[PDB]
A = this chain, B = another copy of it.
Amino acid sequence: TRIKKISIEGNIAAGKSTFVNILKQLSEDWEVVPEPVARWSNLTMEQKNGGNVLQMMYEKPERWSFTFQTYACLSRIRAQLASLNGKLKDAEKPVLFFERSVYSDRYIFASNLYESESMNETEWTIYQDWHDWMNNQFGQSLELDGIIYLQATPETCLHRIYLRGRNEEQGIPLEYLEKLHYKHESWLLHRTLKTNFDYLQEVPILTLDVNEDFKDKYESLVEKVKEFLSTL
């Protein structure tokens, strides 16, 4: 069987990493590609570069947005390709869970930075040009079979940012989370956001409310995932 690729999407501190860590333990057919940027936050060359650029961006996003976004997406593509070529070898219903996708990189985060004037027009268009070609050449086997959207309120997310306590995030205001929320809702709940990838309009999406704490109590959430997978 061909691996099913499922993206986990959601706002900052919505609980994607918690959820994906719960999933991977529940089945030998289920694997996980963590978001490289989250590992950066926390020795290696990528982590050192990622460390710096992530810190530089949150210090001055108008200087570093483009550099940061291109490296985050490159890193994602590479990690995601490394998991595909490998893993879920003999499994009967193999599922690979992506913590975010190349689409959320572009259409949530990079888009947002452009609209908040942290990227100018040249940077945005260069980025999009890069993204398009970077996809077709290297990322055709990354195409998604489905999307799981972890919906939390910006208020929950800001609270959860606090709990976690990554330094580079404690500066984030509710308004920034609200903008990111609006783009998640557009793309995933309403499905208004048009992309440059035609297949994404016919891609099935599961929306889960994750406002209530689920660390010790997730069985309902996982049952929905199982129902969803069975339709793919």
Question: What residues on B are CB-neighbors of A122 within 8 Å?
Answer: 49, 52-53, 56, 67
Contact partner of A126 among B67, B123, B125, B126, CB < 8 A? Answer: B67
Question: What residues on B are CB-neighbors of A45 within 8 Å?
Answer: 125, 129
Chain A facing B: main interface SS: helix
Question: What residues on B are CB-neighbors of A125 within 8 Å?
Answer: 45, 48-49
Contact partner of A137 among B67, B71, B130, B138, CB < 8 A? Answer: B138
Instruction: Answer yes or no: A133 CB below 8 A from chain B CBs.
Output: yes
Instruction: Answer yes or no: A74 CB below 8 A from chain B CBs.
Output: yes
The interface bits of chain A over 50-73 (1 if a CB of B lies within 8 angstroms of the residue's CB, else 0) are 001100100000010011001100
Instruction: Answer yes or no: A191 CB below 8 A from chain B CBs.
Output: no
A99 → B minimal CB distance (Å): 20
Interface size range of chain A in the complex: 20 to 34
Contact of B133 with A71 in the complex, beta carbons under 8 Å: no
**Complex formed: what's the CA distance from A53 to B127 in Å?**
12
Contacts known (A53-B126, A56-B122, A122-B53); A133 close to B74, Cβ less than 8 A: yes
A29 → B minimal CB distance (Å): 28
A45 → B minimal CB distance (Å): 7
Which residue in chain B gives the minimum CB-CB distance to A56?
B122
**Complex formed: what's the CA distance from A137 to B46 in Å?**
18
The interface bits of chain A over 95-134 (1 if a CB of B lies within 8 angstroms of the residue's CB, else 0) are 0000000000000000000000000001101100110011
Instruction: Answer yes or no: A160 CB below 8 A from chain B CBs.
Output: no
Contact of A46 with B138 in the complex, beta carbons under 8 Å: no
Question: What residues on B are CB-neighbors of A129 within 8 Å?
Answer: 45-46, 49, 71, 74
Chain A to chain B: the 5 pairs with minimum beta-carbon distance, closest first: A52-B122, A49-B126, A71-B126, A49-B125, A49-B122
Q: What are 26 inter-chain pairs, A to B, with CB distance below 8 A?
A: A45-B125, A45-B129, A46-B129, A48-B125, A49-B122, A49-B125, A49-B126, A49-B129, A52-B122, A53-B122, A66-B67, A67-B67, A67-B122, A67-B123, A67-B126, A70-B70, A71-B126, A71-B129, A71-B130, A74-B129, A74-B130, A74-B133, A78-B133, A134-B138, A137-B137, A137-B138
